[PDB]
Amino acid sequence: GTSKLKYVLQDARFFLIKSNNHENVSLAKAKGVWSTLPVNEKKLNLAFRSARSVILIFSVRESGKFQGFARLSSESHHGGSPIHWVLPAGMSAKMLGGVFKIDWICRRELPFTKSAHLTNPWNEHKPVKIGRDGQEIELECGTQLCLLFPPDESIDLYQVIHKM
Ligand SMILES: CNC(=O)c1n[nH]c2ccc(Br)cc12
């Protein structure tokens, strides 16, 4: 069903995450973590304090799809086990900020062809697939985008609801 999903998404904030490679999203799905540049880290930490749920919606660059979405379960923190992110070309992971813990809500993919009717008011009403890493997606667009994903019957939102 979709009722617990709609409960989690109620009055949530949504952010577009653009990964340069599939390996970082695989690592995120396996470890329940994400890391981003400080400019986005600050935005996400502000949002985490201000909203019932902060949803990251993931897209691998050039893949033509979203790879799933997840809910922040903490602000960013430093000093955990290192995460062996792949950076594009030979760039340093030092550029990254803290680590956010995340609970996955959907690990299934959604092709951009299925979201072509959704525009994001906070990015000039361009299609929601279009946007820089960290672009905020307005509430209604973000909710409809999440509801387009195939149901992920491996996930139980009961434990996510309790963290709200
Ligand atoms: C695991 N997260 C990343 O790899 C990442 N997040 N935002 C970025 C901006 C530029 C570069 Br290069 C890499 C990233």
Side-chain angles (χ1 to χ4, degrees), residues 1-22 24-30 32-51 53-61 63-80 82-91 93 95-100 102-113 115-131 133-139 141-164:
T2 56
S3 295
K4 288 203 291 296
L5 172 58
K6 295 174 175 168
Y7 184 83
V8 169
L9 298 185
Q10 180 57 30
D11 295 305
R13 300 178 68 176
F14 306 83
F15 291 88
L16 182 66
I17 302 297
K18 288 278 146 103
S19 177
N20 290 86
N21 52 74
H22 278 286
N24 285 353
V25 162
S26 166
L27 229 40
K29 284 170 168 181
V33 288
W34 191 247
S35 194
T36 192
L37 288 180
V39 63
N40 284 330
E41 186 194 12
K42 294 181 209 103
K43 282 158 109 213
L44 291 185
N45 282 325
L46 276 161
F48 182 81
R49 305 152 185 158
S50 80
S53 286
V54 177
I55 305 298
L56 301 184
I57 309 179
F58 287 84
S59 182
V60 177
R61 291 185 201 282
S63 71
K65 313 170 179 168
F66 305 95
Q67 280 74 35
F69 59 97
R71 181 183 175 282
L72 289 189
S73 65
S74 81
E75 282 187 67
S76 66
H77 294 285
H78 307 80
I83 301 162
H84 296 134
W85 304 115
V86 176
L87 289 324
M91 258 162 291
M95 76 179 119
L96 297 170
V99 167
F100 293 87
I102 61 176
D103 294 300
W104 286 85
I105 302 165
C106 179
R107 287 186 176 81
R108 312 263 315 259
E109 52 176 52
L110 180 81
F112 286 170
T113 48
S115 61
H117 60 299
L118 300 174
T119 57
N120 179 7
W122 299 155
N123 195 25
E124 298 181 40
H125 284 98
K126 296 168 172 187
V128 65
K129 79 182 183 182
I130 297 293
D133 182 48
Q135 168 73 56
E136 189 165 358
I137 305 169
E138 175 277 323
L139 171 64
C141 183
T143 297
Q144 293 318 123
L145 175 51
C146 287
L147 289 174
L148 288 176
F149 284 74
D152 186 342
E153 291 156 24
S154 75
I155 278 163
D156 187 352
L157 293 181
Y158 173 85
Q159 292 85 0
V160 164
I161 287 182
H162 275 31
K163 309 182 190 213
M164 320 172 16

